[PDB]
């Protein structure tokens, strides 16, 4: 029979039955499953430092963002994009293709076709759950202990005075695997005193670090996560073969394969310069990048006044509402550019979510 | 900041 996996070390965010204000630090903020009091109750240590207990039966206060640190894996599978084998963590199987699967990183990282609907297969014992397409679903940003975050020592600190003392600060440079069997479970820190080392952020449910300034850790499809209990769209190899004399390849750039970058530079070397939320600048061949997007916060845009097309465009992105009718032809301001490249536009006082093709720059 | 919830 099916049973619950008490996956200690799972990286979680708030769930559908959440009623605990901003204990987590807000929606999208990430925490670590420390332990299970019972099959009904779980204790989480949030990245902000607050440790608390939550429901994981009947009511569900938590969604699983990344189970990979628990080491749970689907032997006999492979992610057809990044070629992780076996898939560790949640398994995502394209329902509309023959024998195609993605890992969590690639799934939330918008690999494969966004209009193809996937099955979620959380555990080896799980029955597959058909989902809405990513393209019509809400995407939000993870926040907490990620590259660029400012941290202090956490509760499970057992590393003497490597940080120069309790309360002394450092910078997370990169999320790494504490071990081969537990990916995305560690954070490499460069302390303010020049010391540097790798620390547990999820491994065996341990929390060696605490945020004092959380960082963005990429975007995810919130409603596709199971309840607990500048862009690159080419193959790694095609990207590598294109970089032969236009920047080159170092593994430290892997982030780029699933992260939105801000084109802040061009250069004399017939190439491009991109910065990422990590804080990393990196150089590229023109063919490796695709725009996404052509708008900036503050840009004034006119809403499309062809109703047929805006209906098509908005429905295609799961954002149509008849209430939007009065906005046709109107000029508004780009308030925010979402991770799925849709635009939060302020128009007629109110704000709406638009397909970027449904507006034109004024 | 250890918090204890009850339900
Ligand atoms: Zn993958
Ligand atoms: Zn497919």
Q: How many helices, marked H, and strands, marked E, lie in chain B? A: 0, 0
Phi and psi at A288, nearest 5°, equal -75, -30
Quick one: tokens of A296?
Answer: 């900036």
Burial tier of A180 (Cβ tally within 10 Å: 0-12, 13-18, 19+):
exposed
| Dihedral sign from CA coordinates of A180, A184, A188, A189 | negative
> Which 3 state secondary structure label does DSSP give A219?
strand
Parallel, antiparallel, or unpaired: how do β-strands A271-275 and A262-267 relate?
A: antiparallel
Parallel, antiparallel, or unpaired: how do β-strands A351-354 and A343-346 relate?
A: antiparallel
Query: Residue A228: how many CA atoms within 13 Å on its side-chain side?
Result: 38
CB A117 within 8 A of CB A130: yes
* Rounded distance between C-alpha atoms, residue A336 and residue A221, angstroms: 18
> Which 3 state secondary structure label does DSSP give A88?
strand
CB A149 within 8 A of CB A172: yes
Closest CA to A222 of A107, A113, A315: A107
CB A92 within 8 A of CB A107: yes
**Resolution, in Å, please?**
2.1
Contacts of A308 (CB under 8 A, 6+ apart): none
Report the Cα A100 to chain-centroid distance in Å. Answer: 21
Report the Cα A27 to chain-centroid distance in Å. Answer: 13
Quick one: tokens of A198?
Answer: 């790798």
CA-based diameter of chain B, in Å?
20
Closest CA to A353 of A312, A320, A309: A320
From chain A residues 167-226, the ones with a CB under 8 A of any chain B CB are none
B2–A51 C-beta distance less than 8 A: yes
Q: Read off the DSSP letter of residue A281.
A: E
CB A227 within 8 A of CB A63: yes
> Which residues, listed in sequence order, are joined to residue A62 by a DSSP beta bridge?
A14
> Which residues, listed in sequence order, are joined to residue A215 by a DSSP beta bridge?
A144
The Å distance, Cα A94 to ligand 2 centre, comes to: 5
* Rounded distance between C-alpha atoms, residue A30 and residue A149, angstroms: 12
A55–B7 C-beta distance less than 8 A: yes
Set of chain B residues whose Cβ sits within 8 Å of the Cβ of A53:
3-5
Q: Which residues surround the ion ligand 2 when the cut-off is CB under 5 Å? A: A 94, 96-97, 116
Burial tier of A322 (Cβ tally within 10 Å: 0-12, 13-18, 19+):
exposed
> Of the bound ligands, which one is closest to the alpha carbon of residue A85?
1
B5–A51 C-beta distance less than 8 A: no
B1–A51 C-beta distance less than 8 A: yes
* Rounded distance between C-alpha atoms, residue A50 and residue A48, angstroms: 6
Closest CA to A69 of A49, A90, A52, A83: A90
> Which 3 state secondary structure label does DSSP give A111?
coil
Q: CB contact, 8 Å: A55 with chain B?
A: yes
> Of the bound ligands, which one is closest to the alpha carbon of residue A114?
2
Q: DSSP assignment of A237-276, as one string?
A: HHHHHH-TTTT---GGGGGGGS---EEEEEETTTEEEEE-
Cis omega (within 30 of 0) for bond into A334: no
> Which 3 state secondary structure label does DSSP give A168?
coil
Q: CB contact, 8 Å: A51 with chain B?
A: yes
Can you give the residue range of the structural domain that contains A177?
A: 142-219
Phi and psi at A116, nearest 5°, equal -80, 125
Q: How many CB atoms lie within 10 A of CB A293?
A: 16
How many inter-chain contacts (A to B, CB under 8 Å) are there?
19
* A211 appears as a binding residue in the annotation: no
CB B2 within 8 A of CB A53: no
* Rounded distance between C-alpha atoms, residue A101 and residue A81, angstroms: 8
Burial tier of A140 (Cβ tally within 10 Å: 0-12, 13-18, 19+):
middle
* Rounded distance between C-alpha atoms, residue A32 and residue A45, angstroms: 5
Q: CB contact, 8 Å: A131 with chain B?
A: no
Closest CA to A46 of A138, A122, A142, A141: A142
CA–CA distances in Å: residue A136 to residues A189, A245, A319, A342? 37, 38, 8, 11
CB A273 within 8 A of CB A282: yes
Q: CB contact, 8 Å: A43 with chain B?
A: no
Q: CB contact, 8 Å: A141 with chain B?
A: no
∠ Cα A29 A30 A35 (to 5°): 140
Q: How many CB atoms lie within 10 A of CB A240?
A: 13
Q: How many CB atoms lie within 10 A of CB A95?
A: 14
* Rounded distance between C-alpha atoms, residue A324 and residue A314, angstroms: 10
> Of the bound ligands, which one is closest to the alpha carbon of residue A84?
1
Tell the residue number behind the tokens 């790798």, with chain if given.
Answer: A198
Report the Cα A308 to chain-centroid distance in Å. Answer: 33
Phi and psi at A312, nearest 5°, equal -55, -50
The Å distance, Cα A106 to ligand 1 centre, comes to: 4
Set of chain B residues whose Cβ sits within 8 Å of the Cβ of A54:
5
Closest CA to A331 of A307, A309, A304: A304
CATH number of the domain enclosing A38: 2.30.30.40
A59–B7 C-beta distance less than 8 A: yes
B5–A20 C-beta distance less than 8 A: yes
């Amino acid at each position: 029979s099916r049973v619950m996996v008490e996956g200690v070390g799972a990286r979680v965010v708030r769930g559908p039955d959440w009623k605990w204000g901003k204990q987590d630090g807000g929606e999208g903020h990430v925490g670590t499953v420390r332990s299970f009091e019972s099959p009904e109750e779980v204790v989480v240590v949030w990245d902000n430092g607050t440790a608390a207990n939550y429901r994981c039966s009947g009511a569900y206060d938590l969604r699983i963002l990344d189970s990979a640190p628990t080491g749970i894996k689907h032997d006999g599978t492979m992610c057809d994009t990044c070629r992780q084998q076996p898939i560790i963590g949640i398994r995502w199987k394209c329902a509309e293709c023959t024998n195609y699967d993605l890992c969590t990183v690639c799934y939330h990282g918008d690999k494969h076709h966004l209009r193809h609907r996937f099955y979620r297969i959380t555990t080896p014992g799980s029955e597959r759950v058909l989902l809405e397409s990513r393209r019509k679903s809400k995407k939000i940003t993870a926040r907490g202990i990620f590259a660029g975050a400012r941290v202090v020592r956490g509760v499970d600190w057992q590393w003497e005075d490597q940080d120069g003392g309790n309360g002394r600060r450092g910078k997370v440079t990169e999320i790494q695997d504490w071990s081969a069997s537990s990916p995305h479970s560690a954070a490499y820190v460069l302390w303010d005193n020049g010391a540097k080392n790798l620390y547990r952020v999820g491994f065996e449910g341990m929390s060696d670090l605490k945020c004092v300034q959380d960082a963005k850790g990429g975007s995810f499809y919130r409603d596709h996560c199971p309840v607990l209990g500048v862009n690159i769209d080419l193959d790694l190899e095609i990207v590598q073969s294109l970089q032969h004399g236009h920047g080159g390849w170092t593994d430290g750039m892997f982030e780029t394969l699933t992260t939105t970058g801000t084109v802040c530079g061009i250069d004399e070397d017939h190439d491009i310069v991109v910065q990422y939320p990590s804080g990393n600048r990196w150089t590229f061949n023109p063919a490796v990048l695709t725009k996404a997007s052509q708008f900036q916060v503050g840009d004034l845009v006119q809403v499309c006044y062809d109703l047929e097309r805006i209906k098509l465009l908005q429905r295609g992105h799961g954002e149509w509402a008849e209430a939007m009718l009065p906005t046709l032809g109107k000029v508004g301001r780009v308030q925010q550019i979402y991770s799925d490249s849709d635009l939060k536009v302020e128009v007629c006082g109110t704000s709406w979510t638009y397909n970027p093709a449904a507006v034109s720059k004024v | 900041n250890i918090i204890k919830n009850t339900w």
